[PDB]
């Protein structure tokens, strides 16, 4: 599907993606989100980091991916007491406030980097379980290395999966977001179907809760045959294809998968660049590299290789002179009047965004194009 010109350029962007991720990996193992972007510098997310780690794992850098899982594991084991206290509070009928939950941003030394009253999210813990299990399966590794951290994440998610929280985009705390529910499902099915974890005390519970998640999405998260942004909405979100691949609510050839890819393409995909959601005003609502990669990945998995390649090509066209991939680009803006104030307040768009490069690596790998 590619000529030598394209292949050379895609191979170089893959090599550069591995380099930029591993060069900026913190000494303690964390992947940063964006080392030069004002609002993200100094922090790590489990969401960004897990997809970054999956790209690196597919690339074959076992060492780098493993240091990220080490970091996450250690951060989570340090929260064993906090999670036990939350669970005890629940058992007393004293449901903890958002302000007491596990964080979204982490500092590189594992402390809260943001106050979860303002950005409480549960997806990243689900993504990490999916990522570490997938990595260990790929490379034949013993999960006992990371098991006590896995136990913290599983205990937390089994208790709090059905709580309203902010979405992947740190918005709309009162709602329950289908790509958040999807991320949690992916992580729970990963550990619940992992033979190395067959004797864990939570083994069966993780598949029962994953089924509960699918019940909720079936009841309130599907409209006109497609997934929707949050339970009880009609709109779509560019994150929704993650609920198919990799998180597995439905197979790639399911009608809901096809209809969801179609709805995202129709409502959010302009010339290969995928918007987050129609109402998005963040930097005017630009086109996100990681969402184009996510749609491309899902198209590849469904057998639409040409569609996958079209999105891969669009991403490659957004690399700057150094090969760096931005968070988003403004070739099409949903709400152009809103862009200037964001640029003024936080500066020019995050570049490189490590998650952009991680997703690039995943899609390139799916298409058999790693050098």
From Swiss-Prot:
One of its GO terms (cellular component) is cytoplasm. One of its GO terms (molecular function) is hydrolase activity, hydrolyzing O-glycosyl compounds. Keywords: Carbohydrate metabolism, Cytoplasm, Glycosidase, Hydrolase, Polysaccharide degradation. The active site is at 167 (proton acceptor), 170 (proton donor), 327 (proton acceptor). Gene3D superfamilies: 1.50.10.10. SUPFAM superfamilies: Six-hairpin glycosidases. This is Isomaltose glucohydrolase. It comes from Kribbella flavida (strain DSM 17836 / JCM 10339 / NBRC 14399).
